[PDB]
Amino acid sequence: AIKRIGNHITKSPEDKREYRGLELANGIKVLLISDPTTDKSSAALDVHIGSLSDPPNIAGLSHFLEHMLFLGTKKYPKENEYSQFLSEHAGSSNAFTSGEHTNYYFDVSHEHLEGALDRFAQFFLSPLFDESAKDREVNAVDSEHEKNVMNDAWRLFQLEKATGNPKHPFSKFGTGNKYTLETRPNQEGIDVRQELLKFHSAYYSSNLMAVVVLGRESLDDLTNLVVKLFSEVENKNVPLPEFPEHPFQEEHLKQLYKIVPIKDIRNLYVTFPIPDLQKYYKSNPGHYLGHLIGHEGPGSLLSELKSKGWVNTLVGGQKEGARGFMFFIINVDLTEEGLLHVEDIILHMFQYIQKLRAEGPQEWVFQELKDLNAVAFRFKDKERPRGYTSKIAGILHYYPLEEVLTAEYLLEEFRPDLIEMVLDKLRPENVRVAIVSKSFEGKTDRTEEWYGTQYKQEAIPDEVIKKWQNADLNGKFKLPTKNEFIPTNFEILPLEKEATPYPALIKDTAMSKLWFKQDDKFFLPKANLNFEFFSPFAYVDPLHSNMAYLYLELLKDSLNEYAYAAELAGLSYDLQNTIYGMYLSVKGYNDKQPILLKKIIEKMATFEIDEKRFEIIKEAYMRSLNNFRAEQPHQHAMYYLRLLMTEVAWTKDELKEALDDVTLPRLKAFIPQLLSRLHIEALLHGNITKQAALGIMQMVEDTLIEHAHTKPLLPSQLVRYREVQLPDRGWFVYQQRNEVHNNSGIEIYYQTDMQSTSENMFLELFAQIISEPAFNTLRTKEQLGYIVFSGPRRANGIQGLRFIIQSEKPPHYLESRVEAFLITMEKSIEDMTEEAFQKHIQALAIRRLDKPKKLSAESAKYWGEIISQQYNFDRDNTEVAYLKTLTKEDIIKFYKEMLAVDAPRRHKVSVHVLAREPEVIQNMTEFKRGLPLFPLVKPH
Amino acid sequence: AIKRIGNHITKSPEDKREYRGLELANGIKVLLISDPTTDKSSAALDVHIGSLSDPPNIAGLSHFLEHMLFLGTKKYPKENEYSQFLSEHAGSSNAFTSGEHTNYYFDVSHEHLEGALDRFAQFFLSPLFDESAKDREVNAVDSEHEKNVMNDAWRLFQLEKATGNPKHPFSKFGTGNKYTLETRPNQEGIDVRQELLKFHSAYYSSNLMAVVVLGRESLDDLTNLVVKLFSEVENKNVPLPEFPEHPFQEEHLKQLYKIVPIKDIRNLYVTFPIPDLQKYYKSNPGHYLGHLIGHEGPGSLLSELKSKGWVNTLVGGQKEGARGFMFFIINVDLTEEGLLHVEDIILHMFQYIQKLRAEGPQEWVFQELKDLNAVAFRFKDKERPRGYTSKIAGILHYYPLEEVLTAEYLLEEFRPDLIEMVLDKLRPENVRVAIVSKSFEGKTDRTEEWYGTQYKQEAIPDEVIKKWQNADLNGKFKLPTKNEFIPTNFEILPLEKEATPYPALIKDTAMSKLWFKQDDKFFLPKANLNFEFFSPFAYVDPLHSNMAYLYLELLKDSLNEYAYAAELAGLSYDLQNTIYGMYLSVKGYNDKQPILLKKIIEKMATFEIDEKRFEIIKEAYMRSLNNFRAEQPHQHAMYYLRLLMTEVAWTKDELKEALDDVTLPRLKAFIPQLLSRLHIEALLHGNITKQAALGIMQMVEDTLIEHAHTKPLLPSQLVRYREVQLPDRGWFVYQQRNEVHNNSGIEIYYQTDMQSTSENMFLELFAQIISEPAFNTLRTKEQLGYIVFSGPRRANGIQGLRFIIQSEKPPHYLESRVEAFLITMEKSIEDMTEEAFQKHIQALAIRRLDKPKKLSAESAKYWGEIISQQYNFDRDNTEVAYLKTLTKEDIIKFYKEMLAVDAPRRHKVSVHVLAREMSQAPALPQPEVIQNMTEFKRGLPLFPLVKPH
């Protein structure tokens, strides 16, 4: 069925990838991506037969088929063979299934597309779905359900799927566990495999593909190479799975629901099933809804609710649904005092609806957000070869081949009818209410079938109905104003005399230190900024750390309602604290980061306090403190890891106790004492000059001395924390008991050495050569537990080696199998040939040598050196040049004194994180009391 | 001329030392001390021939003779044989010279009374005065005057000696330099030695001796031992040198002086030459005057002068002088407004004089302070066998044999006529004025002859004079009230079933820590108490550490006016800041330590700040911060020593700079935040029980939580500062230039080890064995300088070895000389016999083993364990048990790897202190200069701290 129809494609002229769409006569839509500049080529295939076309008795038949359609052909019937061919050419494929799609996508090393096409063609001629791949892949799907046990959003999602019409095919179960996929059909004698063959043969083989290939080959060779190759798909005219009715048919409308959550949250969830705008993608009022409903601005609803203290956060907007119907969701966070006023919150919601009803549609919002679509559509930076092709193949089904790239970022018409229409869909007739609160006890009986969440209707009384009906009024509400942060500075400045691949010290004082580099590679109008604010007062107490948290948090939170317009313009930022000081990040365009950032410095320099806001944030961090008894035991192990291996550390227990005495006058007194004398360090990167960067820095510290009279710090009180020396041979351990999880954790740590050129290679190559056999033996073969991790630990200028495994075991028993794996790797050193060595050092080589893809990525790497103050900018080529000087026999010399069991320089320490039910380590103070301390690193 | 007369002596009934006085017919006053339980016996001899009876041409002739009397006897014509015979058996003699006395004293190890005294008797028969002793001792006297150049109190002393009557023998020069000892006689052809023999023969043999022997034999055997041994002195009846005149004979009276000092001080010195009250020792009005003049009480003068902020400190009272005359001095500190209002200060002085004239004498004060000296004389602890005997032999000359122990601490009568009489003597007629300020520039022309300070007469105009006489009025002056800190608690508590030889941890909290022992040995109603207050916020920065200083300082000054009677009653204390926190000490009787200490805790818990008191203390310590550019280079070197050999250290520059921002609201806001949360560790020792100690401690910490809502500290914030590891083979050095001094300093340091039982005896034995050869060759023979010090360094639980030398040398040349001595000691390893091993470790052994001599003494040792948290109570016997286990080859192995130059364990570091403009050495390793001490220590490891015993 070799059919092709195409022409010139509107291709958003920043990309150079020339495009062409065509449709094959067996229901295969073909979009051609030609990138002769890509390192890795990619391809994607979306079948519009989704998981709504599954049989009602067997869950995840399309899910298990798109898992199983890879493995087993008449060419290659072996179990991992297709995947082993993707292990040859470095490609990491994945595929998925939705209600209206079942989608495939894959990449490849450089040009080996054909090889995967040869592995791919006999999927349509003869899919096999054999015994063993099936019986392990069902364990993979059951593990997928097992890891989605504790994700409550899928529980509530399925709760939306099941509390509609349970007869409607929307109400089916998407993934399917062990029990539904293979326990119930074969006890009913239904072969899952014959269903697979039926499903693929009738449904998949017929029609509804949407293929797209990111190839490097040409426009034409891959074209008449794959067009010709797909006539094995034969049209049978299977109809498109659509729904002519929504499952919400007034049984669950004008209804309340009360949900008991697994996580300690407070939420209210409102859903509106709404008619189709799939034909109305052109004007697309749902984008207008997402702009207007979730705006946080002058006279907005969230501004008043923060001013009323009822709402912490919200999200709302259009949720897509079936071909016929669509959804409209509202998901808000709840405070304490929202509980008596829940209905009043809903009243304010109807007030905002009436505010939109009062002023009707708006046109300058439509044209302005259209222009924002224009700007963001042009200034698309790059594209991932994975995921992008799966997305545009997702919309290749619904959109013409020239409209796939102008997907939603261009708007033709203005539809005040549709906007008023969905406002007519926002009425008390149309409301669904789902309340998320922990307090629901003994009262929510009706339990979910698959996962088990529990709810109750408690239909709305008439007082609230009539209050919903009559009260369509205005309160605070105003329409929001135009943003002011729109840039015009898009002009790339050519590189000057500062022609460096690494940021140079353009300014150093005793107050500041300023490193700078322009965008050599990426050539973007944006710029990224990193800031170190050093302070003595940071980790003096639990109290001061609490004051750092609360201060920075409520501080950033204050001008956040103003910041919504800043993030609305495309300018992101970060405020962070450290044990050493404060961290500031500024990312975005060149426009008003001086103006706005100066306004930020002036804001946090001279700042005021609300009384009850202070109490809520106080309680909130108190909540996070009480929360700290309940998290995942690997986080618990990393907490002890970074606890013991620093110089001083305040525990979360005494942090929890210390909030009994944190008063507002004490903080408010501390702040100018804090700000009186401190150090600032800054990294600047992007489309600017050096002298303008000097003027911005001069602005910033001028502002600082102007408001709070910042003085520099003494280079004897410019300190870092060291790391604990051990007596070179001991293996010490202790235990900690978990409360929540029945699994036990454990972590083993190695004091190797500073980051020298030798030790980086030693540790990286030894870790990577024990990385994949650990995956093969320990997790795959030994099946100890799902959370098994190994690897490095770079801290305080000292390398380290760490291992994270949680399971329910005796910990010394678990250590015994760890040591068994250590002996296995120990002999596997001696089992290394030259070839294993060479392929591994090539693996390490490509692991190390990889260009950045973002200014923030390389700024994060450089900043990661700056926080260690090392500046060894060409450690990459130095260490790689060193890497070729290593042998296998070298690492025995690394193994024997440092790593072996008889090793005299073995620096080994373990920590047990026991389930819910050497020498011991009783006192961490007495631990550090008679141990030496490491020296620090000479900075390059 | 052996004459003896004695009986029972009033012996202050706590002592058991049996006594006997007698006077020999050759003019020798004899006091017999019989203590058969004393470890060391001693003896002392004072001669009333002083340095005022010297010939007018040679200064310090009796001084040079009493240095030279030691060297040379007809039995032993060798130079040091007396002194070396006291170097054999641990007897440490010394002698001194005064205008009216020349005094000799020695001691002996146990039994050497006859030995040393037989070496001492020959001195009367045959002193030799040979060439070499003469020519080295004149350099010793001139170097003694040269090191006494810069002592400003002797400069002002000699300025008092010279600005009086220049005809009176008070105007002579007491010590005598090289110039007067051997430059003026030989250019006049006068033999110094024939003067010595003339002086010794004519003056000494006659009379005026006052001998005393602390012996351990009996009252009678030692008596007819020494009375047989001393008849060799034969009387010649030289009359008693007395002066019928005072030296201030209206030439320099009612006169001013403006003195330029060597140190940056501000002082005013007022002197009243007054007639003799030595005949009035029975009633002794002068002690009552010194009590009244310098009293700090309600309506007192000092209360107002502090209240005016003009006087930082003062001292006044009677100064003793010659036999004929005596002095009365007033020495006060000066502030900024004190500089303009000196005359008003004099007005305040005459106002207090008018208060004394207004109310006249007082009797209840006389009876009260007399009873205080009665009790204080009644209850005495113990004595040093050296120095005490020289003192009572000083007054054995002037008092009968039963009054030498009731010397001045018992008073018969009240003499208001004497009080009024000296009150008539204290008038503007009798005023001498000496102003000390270094701000006197271009105005003080008349330079001192010997020392070189410069002064000006600046005769007072008549307006101030007439203002001095007429203005004798009273303002807000009151007599001070009766004390309440007088104890009747004198009852020795019998020891209970809780019988410990070491203080036990009787109370432990996360708030407190309490150690306690009762007085086993001393049986005194007194008690001594030591306290550390640990705090995190003390050493965070220079700023708040300065604020802790100023706080504790102005705090202690506040309740000082109250504390004056307590310390006057016998209740002493200490407040002191540390890098960690505050240090508290409570010492005295058992009477009111809860009451007074409770009032102290309430005082420093709830304390307020005055603005101008703050300004004065702020400026004063501000002057102390740039004062540190001016001290001695060895002290400067020890500053760098404690700078570098701690974990963190703030320099004087950044400490000086940190007072630029100290406002009173920042300070007073910080202090209760500072004092919000802290820990206490405490040693209590003396006449008390355990439960009452628990109640006192409970009272204190309860009071603390009552005032400032104190909660205990976290055991993760119980920290110490560590000590820096070296790279185990390196030797680094750097230099610092002293601005003022032309001398160079140096200090060399060795990181040995922690205090293990082996290393203590290693370092003690090696330290003692290098003491005498370094003293023999480097300071004595090579004549490097006066600053030649060595010894241990126990810090941060780490032992250490240090050498402190400040001399005028190139520092690497001085290093070369040091290393030459190190090679000399290296050779002296193999030169040690077994006998020089055993006698030396026995010397160390008796050096180590000793009972304490004060309840405070052992408290300082125990507290020195407590600050190191060690508590190894029997570390001494443990170290002795190791001390018996050592060989010669042990110290070779200690030498080779740790001490030698070919050593893989070299922890050697030196520090140069340069001069103002700054015999065989091998190839030393290259050091590195230390530009940034933080970046120096950046690649240095750190020591562990000690697991506490």
Residue numbers in the entry:
A (entry chain B): 46 to 962, 989 to 1011
B (entry chain A): 46 to 963, 981 to 1011
Study text:
IDE is a 110 kDa zinc metalloprotease that readily dimerizes in solution (Kd =~ 10 nM). IDE has at least two major conformational states in its catalytic cycle; open-state IDE captures substrates and releases products while closed-state IDE performs catalysis.
The three apo-IDE structures derive from combinations of the IDE partial open (pO) and open (O) states. Furthermore, two subunits within O/O or pO/pO states have noticeable differences in the distance and buried surface between IDE-N and IDE-C and the dihedral angle. Our cryoEM data reveal that two IDE-N domains within the IDE dimer undergoes rigid body motion, allowing IDE to undergo the transition between the open and ‘closed’ states without the assistance of substrate.
